[PDB]
Amino acid sequence: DAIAIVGMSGRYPGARNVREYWDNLVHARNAIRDIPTSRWDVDKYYDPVKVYCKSMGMLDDIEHFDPLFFNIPPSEAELMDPQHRIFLQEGYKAFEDAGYNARTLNEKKCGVYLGIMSNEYGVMLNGNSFAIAAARIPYFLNLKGPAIPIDTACSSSLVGTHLARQALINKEIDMALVGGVSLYLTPESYMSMAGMLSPDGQCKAFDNGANGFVPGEGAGALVLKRLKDAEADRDHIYGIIIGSGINQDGKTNGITAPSAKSQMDLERDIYETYGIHPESISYVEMHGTGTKQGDPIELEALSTVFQEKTDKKQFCAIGSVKSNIGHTSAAAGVAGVQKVLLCMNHKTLVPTLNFTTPNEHFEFEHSPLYVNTELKPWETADGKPRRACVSSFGYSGTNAHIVIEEYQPESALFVLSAKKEKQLKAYAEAMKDFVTSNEDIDLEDMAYTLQTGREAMDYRMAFLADSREMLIKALDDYLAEMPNGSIFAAHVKTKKSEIKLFETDHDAKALLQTWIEKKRLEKVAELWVKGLQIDWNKLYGEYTPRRISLPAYPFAEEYYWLP
Amino acid sequence: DAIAIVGMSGRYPGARNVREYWDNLVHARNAIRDIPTSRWDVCKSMGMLDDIEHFDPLFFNIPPSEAELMDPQHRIFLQEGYKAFEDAGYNARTLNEKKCGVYLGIMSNEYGVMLGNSFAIAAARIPYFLNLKGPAIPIDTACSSSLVGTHLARQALINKEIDMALVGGVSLYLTPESYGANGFVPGEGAGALVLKRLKDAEADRDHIYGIIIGSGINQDGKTNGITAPSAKSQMDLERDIYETYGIHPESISYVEMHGTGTGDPIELEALSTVFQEKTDKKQFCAIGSVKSNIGHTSAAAGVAGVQKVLLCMNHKTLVPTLNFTTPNEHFEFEHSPLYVNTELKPWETADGKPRRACVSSFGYSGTNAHIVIEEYQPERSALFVLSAKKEKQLKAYAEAMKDFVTSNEDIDLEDMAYTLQTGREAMDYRMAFLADSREMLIKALDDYLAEMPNGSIFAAHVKTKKSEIKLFETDHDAKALLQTWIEKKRLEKVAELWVKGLQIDWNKLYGEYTPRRISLPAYPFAEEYYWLP
């Protein structure tokens, strides 16, 4: 039936994580920049009539990787496509976002469906097959569900989402990591213009001045489960997929042209199959690439299918995040899904950019659709959950469209750990920023997530706090190395002897068990940082807190490029 | 529920088509040759396709100059895919707007680099050409690719998301760079199957090679090195499939192993162990690997194996697996459910139970697939028509048909004509003839080819005869006359008119005996050379 999205991670132009992503969207920020010479020299390729676009939505630090974390020899890292490296990182972080770790994921029937469409690094070198890109994560975490790379161009990650959904409903897998990654490493590839690119370097979605897209880079991942399982397992749930479908354009006027009829059929068939009324939908994240013939075809298709079922006008807002971050290709689908989920969570619609005058080839006034350029409340009538759609169409003609519904649910001991002390410090910094920015965080949920939702690694710190202010101060004290009697820290490898007593003696175990049961947190803390295994469940009686979204591992930022 | 395989086409080392493939397997032929200098200057061996440069771009509305810029993997699959449809008895007209998915196994980019050529486009060629509307997805899970595709197509059909699927694989080895048990020898190939829900296949009166009654995919996960196999994952895969779909290992009498000749002992132990969990019976299940004949055809491995199994079932015959002198030391056969078949023998079944077989395909990236196939058990002059887009190809078509009829003494003449009528597109260059026997049929085709006048033979180029058939297209009594001819007997008249371009309603030729579509030779593409520009 319904598929729950229980974890996410994203890395897009101007946004290192989904929290920065959200911030950028709320502020109507455009992340498209001129391509710097540190990538390539645009002057050596630029001709206005060769490349005619000099702009890109770029990721920062595409060379950065933490190979040691993944048990990969540093020298192998140079030989890995950065698309592989970056997704490995984001994919892992999506699991942690959900509150799953290596221990809890071991041997899980989790499928991995990875959108990927380019091979630039592999060619530059002359390990780097699409098949291996997909299999990295299963190999690292010992997952047992199928590992399939999807190249349907720009629809890739959404097609992957459809396949994962169907495998989940058919009970073939019990979890799914779906995602996409796209980088533009060479003048040659980004180049193919074929007439595709905008000379102004903007995706002017829906606008009469639409004249092509600007290429964008990104990597994103979602964690999917059946809704029934997610509720049983007490996952935190961003929203639910209540319908999806894929199809083909078939014969068009040129293989990269879109088909109005195919887009209509796709959308109609989904709504009919899953009993979804267009009136129930209040936002659609369009493919919306800002191409002159593509945009009006998409609009007319969607409008027509909505209008077959309703006379209501201008009830459904439309937009495209490609207006913010450019066309992130293989990652386009997952980028749009993440936007919609964030909107739903915050009950807020955000502006679509670059829209001055409506495309002349489509009349909005008597349409169910309207272009939203406002940051406003996402209003819903009565009790009803918000619903939104995401469309992704590829240049090869394979289309995807999904429907998302809002999910409507019915002192603490803080622990942190990392594989290196430097990353532990980075972790504490990320947590402090997170707490600082999120004034309403449930402290008990947060502690619980750090306890049960993260792997205990070799460098550890822990502290007590009963308020946001106390939590912030502890992290500050830790970072500043300024003495605080409630802060504990150790490297586990150095503290084996000091712990052995509680691991072997029967009465020491009984005393530790009594400590945990009576909530003697200082004592639990001191032992935990030294490497003692704590049974966290025992910390909680009638009331158990819930896993929530927190910042994920802060990978070492080590530079690897061509050998 | 069950998925019917209703069309197939194949092009493997030593075999231009599935009939030659079968013949090679029956005769235990090995297609592995030394790599010639025309490929590159030299392991020095490969299972090679012939004339990988040949394509018929005009057939596919592709400009000849674009053909040079196409990965031959794309070009060859386009041809084999199309022929799979024709094998099933479907044509451009009958496929138009069909919800047919295309799932294409592909795992290399050599031509593109040597130089449009994305995996995404490779899958989309056929949908674009035939106006199909099911999703077009390329699958790169390495050597499991085509079998992974089969699984996905199967699930989509069962969920009713599509009504037909073309599944296939293609693998070429173009560069030196990308290149007892001692490892594998690389093979080249392209194969395709046409899949439908069984209920539809029977209602539509398709010819059915066999049915897929169970499939699964999974991962190795964490192994000792990313390309190492996991005994446990193989077992879980096989067990889960058999349990989910209610398949008893005792019912299975052949398994086409992944069997790359490296890995071997792990596969043997896994399958053996799973079988033994459910039965004490010994040496009931033959095992083989067509990789012993044609090499490791990579992305096309799965489809090559599935086609072998279907051909075996169709002929109720097991064929030899090659290169086997003494059993792998690391596995003990004597008390196993498994035995290596090295004989050409009858495939025996007990009390009219359908034969069942499995195909395994495991990838170097750790994505595994396994499917279970069951044998399908089904409950006067004719008018033969042929056509092609050029006269040269019509001649080649006639030769292919003559060879086919010569080779098949038991062909049903009514079925064959019926397939030529309803199961092929009537193109611009046409010939037709009457025959009431195999001998007459062979004679007619001989006469046509040798240009010996024969009063039963009619031929025309349709563009030349427009003025001559107008008399029949619009007038009401001319249609009545034609309908009286085709309703019903004179066939000579229908024939003359058909070759000149008149559209015939083939259904009217048949009152309540209607013959069935059968497998026949598909289009003989023009063999034009295209390579790097």
Curated annotation (Swiss-Prot), chain A:
Q: List the disulfide bonds.
A: none
Q: Where is the active site?
A: 154, 287, 327
Specify the Ketosynthase family 3 (KS3) domain's residue ranges: 1-406
Q: Where does the record say this protein resides? A: Cytoplasm
Which function does this protein serve?
Involved in some intermediate steps for the synthesis of the antibiotic polyketide bacillaene which is involved in secondary metabolism.
Q: What is this protein called?
A: Polyketide synthase PksL
Task: Name the gene that codes for it.
Answer: pksL
Curated annotation (Swiss-Prot), chain B:
Record: active site: 143 (for beta-ketoacyl synthase 3 activity), 258 (for beta-ketoacyl synthase 3 activity), 296 (for beta-ketoacyl synthase 3 activity)
Ketosynthase family 3 (KS3) domain location: 1-375
What fragment of the whole protein does this chain represent?
2874 to 3462 of 4538
The identity of this protein, by name, is Polyketide synthase PksL
**Which superkingdom heads the taxonomic lineage of this protein's source?**
Bacteria
Free-text function comment from the UniProt entry: Involved in some intermediate steps for the synthesis of the antibiotic polyketide bacillaene which is involved in secondary metabolism.
Localization: Cytoplasm
